[PDB]
Coordinates of C-alpha atoms and ligand atoms in Angstrom, one line a residue:
Chain A
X1 CA 34.0 3.0 -4.2
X2 CA 37.6 2.9 -6.4
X3 CA 36.4 -1.1 -7.4
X4 CA 35.3 -2.3 -10.5
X5 CA 32.9 -4.2 -10.3
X6 CA 32.5 -7.4 -13.4
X7 CA 29.8 -9.5 -13.5
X8 CA 30.2 -13.1 -15.3
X9 CA 26.9 -14.7 -16.6
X10 CA 26.2 -17.3 -18.3
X11 CA 23.7 -19.9 -18.4
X12 CA 23.4 -23.1 -16.1
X13 CA 26.6 -25.1 -15.8
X14 CA 28.8 -22.9 -18.2
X15 CA 31.7 -22.9 -16.3
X16 CA 31.1 -19.7 -14.4
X17 CA 32.4 -20.7 -11.5
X18 CA 35.4 -22.9 -12.5
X19 CA 36.8 -19.9 -14.8
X20 CA 36.2 -17.5 -12.6
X21 CA 37.6 -18.6 -9.6
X22 CA 41.0 -20.2 -11.3
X23 CA 41.0 -16.5 -13.0
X24 CA 41.1 -14.8 -9.7
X25 CA 44.9 -16.5 -8.6
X26 CA 46.2 -14.2 -11.6
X27 CA 46.2 -11.2 -9.4
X28 CA 45.9 -10.2 -5.2
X29 CA 43.8 -7.3 -7.0
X30 CA 41.4 -9.3 -7.9
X31 CA 38.6 -11.5 -5.7
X32 CA 35.2 -13.1 -6.0
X33 CA 31.2 -13.7 -4.8
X34 CA 30.4 -16.9 -5.5
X35 CA 26.4 -17.4 -5.8
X36 CA 24.9 -18.3 -2.9
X37 CA 23.6 -21.5 -4.1
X38 CA 24.3 -23.1 -1.4
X39 CA 21.7 -21.2 0.7
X40 CA 19.5 -21.6 -1.2
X41 CA 19.4 -25.8 -1.7
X42 CA 19.4 -25.5 2.2
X43 CA 17.9 -22.7 3.9
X44 CA 19.1 -20.7 7.6
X45 CA 18.7 -18.3 9.3
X46 CA 20.7 -16.8 11.7
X47 CA 20.4 -18.6 15.1
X48 CA 20.0 -16.5 19.1
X49 CA 23.5 -14.7 20.7
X50 CA 22.5 -17.9 23.2
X51 CA 20.9 -20.4 21.5
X52 CA 23.3 -20.8 19.3
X53 CA 25.7 -21.8 22.0
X54 CA 23.5 -24.8 22.8
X55 CA 21.7 -25.9 19.8
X56 CA 22.8 -26.9 16.1
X57 CA 22.7 -25.2 13.1
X58 CA 20.5 -27.9 11.4
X59 CA 20.0 -28.3 7.8
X60 CA 16.4 -26.8 6.3
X61 CA 15.0 -27.2 3.8
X62 CA 16.0 -26.7 0.1
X63 CA 14.1 -24.3 -1.9
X64 CA 15.9 -24.5 -5.0
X65 CA 14.3 -28.0 -5.4
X66 CA 11.0 -27.0 -4.8
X67 CA 11.8 -24.5 -6.7
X68 CA 12.9 -27.9 -9.5
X69 CA 10.1 -29.8 -9.1
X70 CA 6.9 -27.3 -8.6
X71 CA 8.1 -23.4 -10.5
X72 CA 4.3 -22.9 -10.5
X73 CA 4.3 -22.7 -6.2
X74 CA 7.5 -22.2 -5.8
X75 CA 9.5 -20.0 -8.6
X76 CA 8.3 -17.1 -6.8
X77 CA 9.9 -17.6 -3.4
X78 CA 13.3 -19.0 -5.0
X79 CA 13.5 -15.5 -7.2
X80 CA 12.9 -13.7 -4.0
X81 CA 15.7 -15.2 -1.5
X82 CA 17.7 -16.0 -4.7
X83 CA 18.4 -11.9 -5.3
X84 CA 17.8 -10.7 -1.4
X85 CA 20.9 -13.5 -0.1
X86 CA 22.9 -12.4 -3.8
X87 CA 22.8 -8.3 -3.0
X88 CA 23.9 -9.4 0.9
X89 CA 26.8 -11.1 -0.5
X90 CA 27.7 -8.9 -3.0
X91 CA 27.4 -6.2 -0.9
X92 CA 29.5 -7.1 1.9
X93 CA 32.3 -8.3 -0.1
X94 CA 31.5 -4.5 -2.0
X95 CA 32.3 -3.3 1.6
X96 CA 34.6 -5.7 3.2
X97 CA 37.2 -7.0 0.7
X98 CA 40.3 -5.2 -1.2
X99 CA 41.2 -3.1 1.1
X100 CA 44.4 -1.1 -0.6
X101 CA 44.9 -2.7 -3.3
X102 CA 45.9 -1.5 -5.8
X103 CA 43.2 -2.0 -9.1
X104 CA 41.1 -4.2 -7.3
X105 CA 38.2 -6.2 -9.6
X106 CA 35.4 -7.7 -7.9
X107 CA 33.8 -9.8 -9.9
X108 CA 30.8 -11.0 -9.2
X109 CA 29.0 -14.6 -11.0
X110 CA 25.7 -13.6 -12.0
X111 CA 24.2 -10.3 -11.3
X112 CA 20.4 -9.0 -9.5
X113 CA 20.0 -7.9 -13.6
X114 CA 20.5 -12.0 -14.6
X115 CA 17.7 -13.1 -11.9
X116 CA 15.3 -10.5 -12.6
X117 CA 15.8 -10.6 -16.9
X118 CA 16.4 -13.6 -17.3
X119 CA 15.9 -16.0 -14.4
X120 CA 13.4 -14.5 -13.3
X121 CA 11.0 -13.3 -16.8
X122 CA 11.8 -16.9 -17.6
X123 CA 9.8 -17.9 -15.2
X124 CA 6.5 -15.6 -15.5
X125 CA 7.2 -16.5 -19.7
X126 CA 6.9 -20.4 -18.5
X127 CA 3.4 -19.2 -16.2
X128 CA 5.4 -20.6 -13.5
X129 CA 5.5 -17.4 -11.9
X130 CA 1.3 -15.3 -12.0
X131 CA 0.7 -11.3 -12.4
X132 CA 0.7 -10.9 -8.9
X133 CA 3.6 -12.4 -8.1
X134 CA 5.5 -10.6 -11.0
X135 CA 4.4 -7.3 -10.7
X136 CA 5.7 -7.6 -6.8
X137 CA 8.8 -9.3 -7.4
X138 CA 10.0 -6.2 -10.0
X139 CA 8.0 -3.8 -7.4
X140 CA 10.5 -5.6 -5.4
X141 CA 13.8 -5.6 -7.4
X142 CA 13.6 -1.7 -8.1
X143 CA 13.4 -0.9 -5.2
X144 CA 15.8 -2.6 -3.8
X145 CA 17.6 -1.5 -6.5
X146 CA 16.8 2.8 -5.8
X147 CA 17.8 1.3 -2.2
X148 CA 21.7 0.1 -3.1
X149 CA 26.6 1.0 -4.9
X150 CA 26.3 -2.7 -7.1
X151 CA 26.6 -0.8 -10.6
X152 CA 28.6 -3.3 -13.0
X153 CA 31.7 -1.8 -14.8
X154 CA 32.2 -3.9 -17.3
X155 CA 30.5 -7.6 -18.0
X156 CA 31.9 -11.2 -18.9
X157 CA 29.5 -13.1 -21.0
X158 CA 30.9 -17.4 -21.1
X159 CA 28.9 -18.3 -24.0
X160 CA 28.6 -21.9 -24.2
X161 CA 25.3 -24.1 -25.8
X162 CA 22.1 -26.0 -24.3
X163 CA 23.4 -28.9 -25.7
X164 CA 27.1 -28.1 -23.7
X165 CA 25.8 -26.4 -20.2
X166 CA 22.9 -30.1 -20.3
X167 CA 26.3 -32.1 -20.2
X168 CA 28.3 -30.0 -17.5
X169 CA 25.3 -30.3 -15.8
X170 CA 25.2 -33.8 -15.7
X171 CA 29.1 -33.9 -14.6
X172 CA 28.4 -31.1 -12.1
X173 CA 25.8 -34.1 -10.4
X174 CA 24.3 -31.3 -8.5
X175 CA 20.5 -33.6 -7.9
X176 CA 18.0 -30.3 -7.6
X177 CA 19.2 -30.2 -11.6
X178 CA 19.5 -33.3 -12.9
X179 CA 16.1 -34.0 -14.3
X180 CA 16.5 -30.0 -16.0
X181 CA 14.9 -30.5 -19.6
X182 CA 17.6 -29.5 -22.8
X183 CA 14.1 -27.1 -23.5
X184 CA 14.8 -25.2 -19.8
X185 CA 18.2 -24.6 -20.7
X186 CA 17.5 -23.3 -24.5
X187 CA 15.2 -20.7 -23.5
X188 CA 17.6 -19.3 -21.0
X189 CA 19.9 -19.2 -23.1
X190 CA 17.8 -17.4 -26.0
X191 CA 18.0 -14.3 -23.2
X192 CA 21.0 -14.2 -22.1
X193 CA 21.9 -13.5 -26.4
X194 CA 19.0 -11.4 -26.1
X195 CA 20.9 -9.9 -22.9
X196 CA 24.4 -9.8 -24.1
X197 CA 24.6 -10.6 -27.8
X198 CA 22.4 -9.5 -29.0
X199 CA 22.2 -6.4 -26.7
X200 CA 17.5 -6.6 -27.8
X201 CA 16.3 -6.8 -23.8
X202 CA 15.7 -3.9 -22.1
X203 CA 15.7 -3.5 -18.5
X204 CA 14.6 -0.5 -16.1
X205 CA 17.7 0.4 -15.8
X206 CA 19.5 2.4 -18.2
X207 CA 23.1 2.2 -17.9
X208 CA 23.5 -0.6 -18.7
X209 CA 22.8 -0.6 -22.2
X210 CA 26.4 1.7 -22.4
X211 CA 28.1 -1.4 -19.3
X212 CA 31.3 -2.6 -21.9
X213 CA 30.7 -6.9 -22.7
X214 CA 32.9 -9.0 -22.9
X215 CA 31.6 -12.5 -25.0
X216 CA 33.7 -15.5 -24.6
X217 CA 33.1 -18.9 -26.2
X218 CA 33.5 -21.6 -22.7
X219 CA 31.9 -24.8 -25.5
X220 CA 35.3 -26.5 -25.7
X221 CA 37.1 -28.3 -23.0
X222 CA 38.9 -25.8 -20.3
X223 CA 42.1 -26.1 -21.1
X224 CA 41.9 -25.5 -25.1
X225 CA 40.6 -21.7 -24.5
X226 CA 42.2 -21.2 -21.3
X227 CA 45.1 -19.2 -22.7
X228 CA 43.5 -17.3 -25.2
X229 CA 40.3 -16.3 -22.7
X230 CA 42.7 -15.1 -20.9
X231 CA 44.0 -12.3 -23.1
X232 CA 40.5 -11.4 -23.9
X233 CA 40.0 -10.9 -20.4
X234 CA 43.1 -8.9 -18.6
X235 CA 42.8 -6.8 -22.7
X236 CA 38.8 -5.5 -21.7
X237 CA 39.7 -4.9 -17.8
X238 CA 42.8 -2.4 -19.9
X239 CA 40.0 -1.1 -21.4
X240 CA 36.8 -0.1 -18.7
Chain B
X1 CA 15.7 13.5 15.1
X2 CA 12.3 12.6 14.0
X3 CA 10.6 10.9 16.9
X4 CA 9.1 7.7 15.7
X5 CA 5.5 6.2 16.9
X6 CA 4.4 3.1 16.5
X7 CA 0.0 2.0 16.5
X8 CA -0.3 -1.1 17.1
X9 CA -3.2 -3.1 17.2
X10 CA -5.8 -6.2 16.4
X11 CA -7.6 -6.0 12.7
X12 CA -10.0 -3.0 13.3
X13 CA -9.3 -1.7 16.4
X14 CA -9.3 1.3 15.3
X15 CA -5.0 2.8 15.1
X16 CA -6.0 4.2 11.5
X17 CA -9.6 6.6 12.7
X18 CA -7.5 7.3 15.8
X19 CA -4.6 8.2 13.8
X20 CA -6.4 10.5 11.8
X21 CA -7.5 11.9 14.7
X22 CA -4.1 13.3 16.6
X23 CA -1.8 14.0 13.1
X24 CA -4.4 17.5 13.5
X25 CA -2.9 18.0 16.8
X26 CA -0.2 19.6 14.9
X27 CA 1.5 20.5 11.8
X28 CA 4.4 18.9 13.4
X29 CA 3.0 15.4 13.6
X30 CA 3.0 13.2 10.5
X31 CA 1.2 9.7 9.5
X32 CA 2.2 7.2 7.2
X33 CA -0.8 4.2 6.7
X34 CA -0.4 0.6 6.6
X35 CA 0.2 0.6 2.5
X36 CA -3.2 -1.4 2.6
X37 CA -4.6 0.0 -0.6
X38 CA -1.3 -1.1 -2.7
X39 CA -2.5 -4.7 -1.4
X40 CA -6.0 -4.9 -2.8
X41 CA -4.8 -3.6 -6.0
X42 CA -1.3 -4.7 -6.6
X43 CA 1.0 -2.1 -8.9
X44 CA 4.4 -1.1 -10.0
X45 CA -5.7 -2.8 -12.2
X46 CA -3.7 -5.7 -10.5
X47 CA -4.0 -8.9 -8.3
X48 CA -5.4 -8.9 -4.3
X49 CA -2.9 -10.4 -2.4
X50 CA -4.6 -10.0 0.5
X51 CA -7.2 -11.4 -0.4
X52 CA -5.6 -14.7 -2.1
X53 CA -3.7 -14.6 1.9
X54 CA -7.1 -14.7 3.2
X55 CA -8.5 -16.9 1.0
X56 CA -5.5 -19.1 0.4
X57 CA -3.5 -18.9 2.8
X58 CA -1.1 -21.9 2.7
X59 CA -0.6 -20.3 -1.0
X60 CA -0.6 -16.8 -0.5
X61 CA 0.6 -15.7 3.3
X62 CA 4.8 -15.5 2.4
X63 CA 3.9 -13.7 -0.2
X64 CA 1.5 -12.3 1.7
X65 CA 4.0 -10.3 4.4
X66 CA 7.3 -10.0 2.3
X67 CA 4.9 -7.8 -0.2
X68 CA 2.7 -5.8 3.4
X69 CA 6.6 -5.6 5.0
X70 CA 8.7 -4.4 2.1
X71 CA 6.0 -2.3 1.4
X72 CA 5.4 -1.5 4.7
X73 CA 10.1 -0.4 4.9
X74 CA 9.9 2.0 2.1
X75 CA 7.1 4.0 2.7
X76 CA 8.3 4.9 6.3
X77 CA 11.1 5.0 5.1
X78 CA 9.3 7.6 2.5
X79 CA 8.4 9.9 5.1
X80 CA 11.2 9.9 6.9
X81 CA 12.8 11.7 4.1
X82 CA 10.7 14.3 3.3
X83 CA 8.1 15.0 5.4
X84 CA 8.4 17.1 8.4
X85 CA 12.4 17.0 9.5
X86 CA 11.5 21.7 9.4
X87 CA 9.2 21.3 12.5
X88 CA 10.1 22.0 16.1
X89 CA 9.5 18.7 17.7
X90 CA 8.6 17.1 14.6
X91 CA 6.6 13.0 15.4
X92 CA 5.5 10.3 12.9
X93 CA 3.2 8.2 13.8
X94 CA 3.2 4.4 12.2
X95 CA 0.3 2.8 11.4
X96 CA 2.0 -0.9 12.9
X97 CA 6.0 -1.6 12.4
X98 CA 7.7 -4.3 10.9
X99 CA 7.9 -6.1 14.3
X100 CA 5.0 -6.7 13.9
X101 CA 4.1 -7.7 11.1
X102 CA 6.4 -10.1 12.0
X103 CA 5.8 -11.1 14.7
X104 CA 1.8 -11.2 15.5
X105 CA 0.9 -11.8 11.9
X106 CA 3.4 -13.3 10.2
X107 CA 3.9 -15.9 13.4
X108 CA 0.8 -17.0 13.1
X109 CA 0.7 -18.1 9.9
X110 CA 3.3 -19.8 10.6
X111 CA 1.7 -21.1 14.0
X112 CA -1.0 -22.3 11.7
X113 CA 1.0 -23.9 9.3
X114 CA -0.1 -21.3 7.0
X115 CA 3.5 -20.7 6.0
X116 CA 6.1 -24.0 6.0
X117 CA 9.4 -24.4 7.8
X118 CA 11.0 -23.4 4.4
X119 CA 8.8 -20.7 3.8
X120 CA 8.9 -19.0 7.8
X121 CA 12.7 -19.6 7.3
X122 CA 13.2 -18.0 4.1
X123 CA 11.2 -15.2 5.6
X124 CA 12.9 -14.6 8.8
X125 CA 16.6 -14.4 7.3
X126 CA 14.7 -12.0 4.7
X127 CA 13.0 -9.5 7.0
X128 CA 17.2 -10.0 9.7
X129 CA 19.5 -8.1 7.0
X130 CA 16.1 -5.9 5.1
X131 CA 16.1 -4.6 9.2
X132 CA 19.9 -4.7 9.5
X133 CA 20.4 -2.3 6.5
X134 CA 18.0 -0.2 8.0
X135 CA 15.6 -0.5 10.8
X136 CA 18.3 1.9 12.9
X137 CA 16.5 4.4 10.4
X138 CA 12.9 2.7 11.3
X139 CA 13.5 2.2 15.5
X140 CA 11.1 3.4 17.2
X141 CA 11.4 5.4 20.3
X142 CA 7.7 4.7 21.3
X143 CA 4.5 2.4 21.1
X144 CA 1.0 3.0 21.1
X145 CA -1.0 0.2 22.2
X146 CA -5.0 -0.5 21.0
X147 CA -6.6 -2.4 22.9
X148 CA -9.7 -3.6 21.9
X149 CA -11.2 -6.2 22.5
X150 CA -11.7 -9.8 19.8
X151 CA -15.2 -9.1 19.6
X152 CA -15.2 -5.3 19.2
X153 CA -12.7 -5.9 16.2
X154 CA -15.2 -8.4 15.1
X155 CA -17.6 -6.0 15.1
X156 CA -15.5 -3.5 13.2
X157 CA -14.8 -5.3 10.2
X158 CA -17.7 -5.8 9.3
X159 CA -19.5 -2.2 10.5
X160 CA -15.7 -1.2 7.9
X161 CA -16.7 -3.5 5.2
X162 CA -13.7 -4.5 3.9
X163 CA -14.9 -7.6 1.5
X164 CA -12.2 -9.5 1.8
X165 CA -12.8 -9.3 5.7
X166 CA -15.7 -10.4 5.9
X167 CA -15.2 -14.1 6.2
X168 CA -12.5 -13.9 9.0
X169 CA -13.3 -15.9 12.4
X170 CA -13.4 -14.5 16.4
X171 CA -11.1 -17.6 16.7
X172 CA -8.4 -15.6 13.9
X173 CA -8.8 -12.1 15.6
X174 CA -7.8 -14.0 19.1
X175 CA -5.0 -15.3 17.9
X176 CA -4.3 -12.3 16.8
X177 CA -5.5 -10.9 20.1
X178 CA -2.7 -13.0 22.3
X179 CA -0.6 -12.2 20.8
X180 CA -0.7 -8.8 21.2
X181 CA -0.9 -9.1 24.6
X182 CA 1.9 -11.2 25.0
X183 CA 3.3 -8.5 23.0
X184 CA 3.1 -5.3 24.4
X185 CA 1.1 -5.6 27.3
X186 CA 2.7 -9.4 29.3
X187 CA 6.2 -8.5 27.3
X188 CA 6.7 -12.2 27.3
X189 CA 7.6 -12.0 23.9
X190 CA 12.2 -10.9 19.9
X191 CA 16.1 -10.4 18.4
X192 CA 15.4 -6.7 18.4
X193 CA 17.0 -6.2 21.9
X194 CA 16.4 -2.0 22.2
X195 CA 12.7 -3.2 21.6
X196 CA 12.8 -4.6 25.5
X197 CA 13.7 -0.3 26.3
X198 CA 10.6 1.2 24.3
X199 CA 7.9 2.9 26.3
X200 CA 4.1 1.5 24.9
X201 CA 1.2 3.6 26.4
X202 CA -1.1 0.8 25.8
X203 CA -5.0 2.4 25.3
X204 CA -8.0 0.8 25.8
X205 CA -10.8 1.7 22.6
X206 CA -13.4 -0.9 23.7
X207 CA -16.2 2.1 23.5
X208 CA -17.5 3.3 20.8
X209 CA -15.2 6.7 20.0
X210 CA -11.5 9.5 23.0
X211 CA -11.2 13.3 24.5
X212 CA -9.1 11.6 27.0
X213 CA -7.1 9.1 24.6
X214 CA -5.7 11.8 22.6
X215 CA -5.1 13.6 25.7
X216 CA -2.8 10.8 27.1
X217 CA -0.8 10.7 23.9
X218 CA 0.1 14.7 23.9
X219 CA 1.8 13.8 26.8
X220 CA 3.3 10.7 26.6
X221 CA 5.0 11.7 23.7
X222 CA 6.5 14.7 26.4
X223 CA 8.1 11.9 28.0
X224 CA 10.1 10.6 24.8
Ligands
ADP301 N1 35.2 -25.3 -19.9 C1 35.3 -26.5 -19.2 N2 35.6 -28.0 -19.8 C2 35.4 -28.8 -18.9 N3 34.2 -28.8 -17.6 C3 33.9 -27.8 -17.2 C4 34.0 -26.4 -17.9 N4 34.0 -25.1 -17.8 C5 33.1 -25.9 -16.1 N5 33.4 -27.9 -16.2 C6 32.9 -28.4 -15.6 O1 31.2 -27.9 -16.1 C7 30.3 -28.4 -14.5 C8 29.6 -26.8 -14.3 O2 30.7 -25.7 -14.6 P1 30.3 -24.8 -13.3 O3 31.7 -24.6 -13.4 O4 29.5 -25.8 -11.9 O5 29.7 -24.2 -13.2 P2 29.0 -22.3 -13.4 O6 29.2 -22.4 -12.2 O7 29.0 -22.0 -14.5 O8 27.4 -23.5 -12.9 C9 31.2 -28.4 -13.6 O9 31.5 -29.7 -13.1 C10 33.3 -27.9 -14.1 O10 33.8 -29.1 -13.9
ADP302 N1 -14.8 3.6 18.7 C1 -14.7 3.5 18.2 N2 -15.9 3.2 18.4 C2 -17.0 3.0 16.7 N3 -16.2 2.5 15.6 C3 -15.6 2.7 15.3 C4 -14.2 3.2 16.9 N4 -12.9 3.3 16.6 C5 -12.9 2.9 15.4 N5 -14.6 2.3 15.0 C6 -15.0 2.1 13.5 O1 -14.2 0.8 12.9 C7 -13.6 0.3 11.4 C8 -12.8 0.2 12.0 O2 -11.2 1.2 12.4 P1 -10.5 1.3 11.2 O3 -9.4 2.8 12.2 O4 -10.5 1.8 10.0 O5 -9.7 0.3 12.4 P2 -7.4 -0.5 11.6 O6 -7.3 1.4 11.7 O7 -7.9 -0.4 14.0 O8 -7.8 -1.9 11.1 C9 -14.0 2.1 11.1 O9 -15.0 1.5 10.3 C10 -13.8 2.9 12.4 O10 -15.1 3.4 12.1
DCZ303 N1 18.4 -16.4 -10.2 C1 19.1 -17.6 -10.7 C2 19.7 -17.8 -9.8 C3 19.9 -18.9 -10.3 N2 19.1 -19.7 -10.6 C4 19.5 -21.9 -10.2 C5 20.1 -21.9 -11.4 C6 20.8 -23.2 -11.2 O1 20.5 -24.4 -10.8 C7 21.4 -22.5 -9.5 C8 22.6 -22.2 -9.0 O2 22.7 -21.1 -10.8 O3 20.0 -21.3 -8.7 C9 17.7 -19.4 -10.7 O4 17.1 -20.8 -11.5 N3 18.1 -18.3 -10.6
DCZ304 N1 1.4 -8.2 7.8 C1 0.7 -7.7 8.2 C2 0.0 -6.5 8.1 C3 -1.7 -7.0 8.5 N2 -1.9 -7.6 7.8 C4 -3.5 -8.2 7.1 C5 -5.1 -7.0 8.4 C6 -5.3 -6.4 8.3 O1 -7.3 -7.5 7.4 C7 -5.6 -5.6 6.9 C8 -4.3 -4.5 6.4 O2 -4.4 -4.1 8.2 O3 -4.3 -6.7 6.6 C9 -1.8 -9.0 7.5 O4 -2.0 -10.0 7.5 N3 -0.4 -9.1 8.0

């Protein structure tokens, strides 16, 4: 497509949703694909066209919480569903949004690359996924990718300390995340740094080595840096 | 333009045997085996996820079922992509389909509580999506149902000698048989509404191996 695809990346509660959903109003050609975290805390599949007329769409289980409560049991299930639901959402907005925009930009809250190379990879490294699960996951992810359009034109990395992220998890108050310890955020932090700052992390996706990356420090209170962040963003986009 | 035909039936009914015979009747006829080897040796020597599922179905059934279907979709798409399409009347025989994966096997595991509600819902959502994207391409023109009794199937499991399967009880095979009968014989069993229209040839394969069965296929296909 003519739509530029830009992923917003960063640790848990770095402020990606906040930033990008405020950022996107600056232009009517700018849209966001949220991460489907609602679909994870309330697991639902489609109703039959007649049954939905008389039966409600009930609340399902919370696979996000199942993963946090027992990662060695539920990591693989969670990570597969996370990626699937993301791909669904990103593909539909690609094929559906920003038609007849002049300079259309679609910002993705996280990417299939961070699902694999940050979150899933970290679970494998922590023995929360075994060899078989990790092989199946990567096999499936490779296949999904070679099938599917989503190639990124750029990455905006929102960098915050593990401590900042831990505080913001508390501020946000998602119930399933309230037992996350500092060490877990630290491990995710180092993965992001390797991928997006030091660029030493190797992926199956050659183009990524070349994709332009904008790194923005988001540790400060929202007002204190937003103007410079916005100006850095428009400057970056002008380069793509 | 490739006609797509799925061969269905219970564990060790004789589907791989039958389709491998069929294949030889024409250069225009190809087969997509169930990727069983890929499940026995997980790779991109790996784990045996078929074995893990049979040994600990409450732990591994969702993982197994997801990979089973993923690997089938992959193999089936691959075969349409190259294997014939320069043939007079090309036919592709699938050893099982995404519909048996979901509505027979995964469904039976949910029923027996080897998957919980969350796993079953994730599985169905994944399958719905994965199909809306492809499926149209993998849509069946006909089904051949190989019907054999659960006892015949249990005997043939023993004859074939797959280690992971040797402990399967008759009762599990009875459950699978009832789902197949419901789907393909009684037609009481899906949210793929085109399937209600797909012709089904039922073949009784309970007897030791068959001439006539193969001819019945050659002619059933001329009606598609
Ligand atoms: N710069 C900031 N200053 C103060 N709070 C922030 C800032 N960025 C995000 N927040 C807050 O931190 C929490 C997590 O932000 P959120 O956008 O939900 O993170 P993410 O989408 O990266 O997980 C929210 O409660 C939000 O109000
Ligand atoms: N009609 C038959 N008579 C005797 N043995 C059969 C017959 N059909 C299959 N077999 C044997 O039974 C076993 C199961 O057959 P196979 O084709 O592997 O089953 P499937 O592909 O349905 O699981 C094999 O060892 C095969 O040689
Ligand atoms: N592949 C992903 C994506 C997200 N998350 C988690 C981190 C947050 O708790 C929540 C939403 O980003 O889901 C995860 O564990 N794995
Ligand atoms: N969706 C599927 C497909 C196949 N099988 C099993 C039954 C046999 O034991 C083996 C190969 O057919 O895999 C399964 O449990 N579920």
